Design a protein around this ligand. Structure first.
Ligand code: FE
Ligand code: FE
Ligand code: FE
Ligand code: FE
Ligand code: FE
Ligand code: FE
Ligand code: FE
Ligand code: FE
Lengths: 178, 178, 178, 178
């Protein structure tokens, strides 16, 4: 039985370019996590408690996604390589602008997964494409959700009264079209 | 015992003009169903989740009404004739405009039932007028309800803040005067 | 952040040929729905109550599948386009013949999904292939189920006694091999 | 306050032709009752226990309908006039033939109600047309039901095996399309 780069018994070798791309995607997820934390803080600074609670949960969720990817590398007997994590963006002129960055961060996370997926297909790594399938499905619902929040905030058109109403929705757990 | 046009034992013959008018009313109900689906989609596209859920339920309800009419024709030993279904309207400039079309569609559904009712009376088909009575009663409450939603949306006068408040009412199941 | 054709924030553009093919598949599902309704009616006309209840449920299910596809287009920020719906077939010489059309309609629905799937693969739209995966899986079980019902009815060889026995199975919810 | 023909306070006079027609309809219902009893007996004589139980219940139901009409005459301060009740038909060559007579008896009961209804309309007796409305509705479901039983028995085509299967359905309470 062969041993993988992390020392465990190796079911099938992984191409180093695919390994590198998974390790980088873990950084993308970790960066989304600290970005949602930064957004949580911005909302708390403006007394938007519902948005603060929503992004606090999202930061924890993105971190769970990152850890889920580190477990896949363990399961494949590959080495992890936790990287330097850049500082998040921390300043926005409005909630609409924040939510725009939020949506783009979700969409960018999906693009990263898609890039890993395409490289797995090139390498015929069916374990990885299967592993990624439910994660792409969750990204579809997250994109749908962030499009909903962004659009609802844009509909408010900067009226504080409407932003308070939406804030209370989020505090209540009303965060999707349903 | 005579057999009806659909092959079952025939309790009493139905005039072909009344049969034709019932078959056409089934199309009216099916068309209202797909119209409310189109309206559900328009609302979902604008993050008006409460209106989206309301019209999603209304599309299912109108379809149930259509099927209820197909069962009456079976019970009368008459043939059904499911027809080509036109494409619904799908574009509106505002929620007020959508709700206006919605109210008119409900009122037009009642007019169709009334036309069937009058033809049954002309033909002295008491089974059909009796069958239609509870359906007219339900139309009265649906007209009352759609007048309520339309008027409440018109009262909002296009203010996004008020439309969000109404949207949340509908998501909560608050869809009538009560 | 870019806006999609339906007005929502756009996570990733969709090729117009793939959009068109999804919109057409929605029509396929809507057409299967009204076809199963027509079959429900044919069975009710011949007092085959179990088959009537089965196809009544199947018509509702196919419609849910159609709506599920309209939600995916919303989630992708694409426009829906609800189309003219052709009239269903409504006449069969026997239950065996009806069930043959029923099986072919299920298989044809899967072919339509497969065609959408292949075009997504050509376009590298991984969101769409992932979205379609559970729906293909459900089609496998539906094909298995309709093959079971068709074959059981064919085994009956037109004996009314056996068709009554099968009818009672379906009324009892015994609709699959299990 | 005026007194009605039966001695009670009279809310509104009834035309004697309408009174006579209601009194005769009570006889129609009583005759259907003893007819279903005769049918119950014929089925019991041939060990068709499910059909025996079904018609035993139907005889009791028709009698309840008759009594319901006698209560309406009391409520209208009109006299009842319970009439000589003819002997029922008691011999049939087959269950198919019995069920044909059964369906015709139900349809004939509805015709009698319709005749009363038309005379009430001529006399503008809105109390009577309102009173009759739910009874016509119940007749629609009874006609639907007897068409179902008749057609299912005809489908059996005189095969004892299929008639036993249907008999067991009826014993189980499976007496309608559902
Ligand atoms: Fe993530
Ligand atoms: Fe996410
Ligand atoms: Fe309706
Ligand atoms: Fe309605
Ligand atoms: Fe389907
Ligand atoms: Fe299906
Ligand atoms: Fe009766
Ligand atoms: Fe009866």
């Amino acid at each position: 039985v062969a041993q993988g780069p992390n020392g465990r018994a190796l079911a099938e070798s992984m191409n180093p370019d695919l390994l590198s791309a998974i390790q980088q995607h873990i950084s993308i997820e970790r960066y989304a996590s600290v970005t949602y934390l930064a957004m949580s803080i911005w909302c708390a600074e403006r007394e938007l408690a519902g948005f603060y609670q929503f992004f606090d949960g999202e930061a924890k969720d993105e971190q769970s996604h990152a850890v889920h990817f580190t477990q896949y590398l363990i399961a494949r007997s590959q080495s992890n390589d936790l990287q330097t994590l850049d500082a998040p963006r921390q300043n926005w002129d409005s909630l609409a602008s924040l939510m725009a960055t939020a949506f783009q961060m979700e969409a960018d996370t999906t693009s990263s997964i898609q890039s890993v997926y395409a490289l797995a297909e090139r390498n015929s790594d069916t374990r990885t494409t299967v592993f990624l399938d439910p994660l792409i499905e969750a990204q579809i619902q997250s994109e749908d959700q962030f499009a909903y929040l962004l659009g609802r905030v844009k509909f408010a058109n900067g009226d504080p009264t409407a932003l308070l109403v939406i804030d209370n929705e989020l505090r209540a757990g009303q965060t999707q079209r349903g």
